[PDB]
């Protein structure tokens, strides 16, 4: 926690899941500003595209 790095791997793994839920939440965050862009025609398909 502060002086020990015990169980770091597990905490790190969970942090990865945290970043995933956060970064992907940011997508929705942006979509909150303008829903037209988000759900209607092009922007979603473009912005997202393909990563994996």
């Amino acid at each position: 926690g502060s002086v020990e790095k015990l169980t770091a791997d597990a905490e790190l793994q969970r942090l990865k899941n945290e970043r995933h839920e956060e970064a992907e939440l940011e997508r929705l965050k942006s979509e909150a500003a303008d829903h037209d862009k988000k759900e209607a025609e092009r922007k979603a398909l473009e912005d997202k595209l393909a990563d994996y």
Binding site: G1, S2, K5, L12, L15, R19, E22, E26
Partner: protein, 87 residues
Amino acid sequence: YVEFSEECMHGSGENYDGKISKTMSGLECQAWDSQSPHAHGYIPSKFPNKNLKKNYCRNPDRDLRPWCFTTDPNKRWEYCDIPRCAA
């Protein structure tokens, strides 16, 4: 790194420790041990073997490529593109 530099990296940047504190988009990287408005769960006290120092861009989770937090209210964090080995 500079205008004229063809340095060779290992491949995934996972084992790379450069003095890069900026993103490709001009955005300044947030300091690791500094508690910025952008909360971070990656405490260096739990990762002393990851060389979490200053505000350099590194790969602490062994991700596809290195990444760092940003001191910009619109971008919590971003990935860093570093030359990969083709040989």
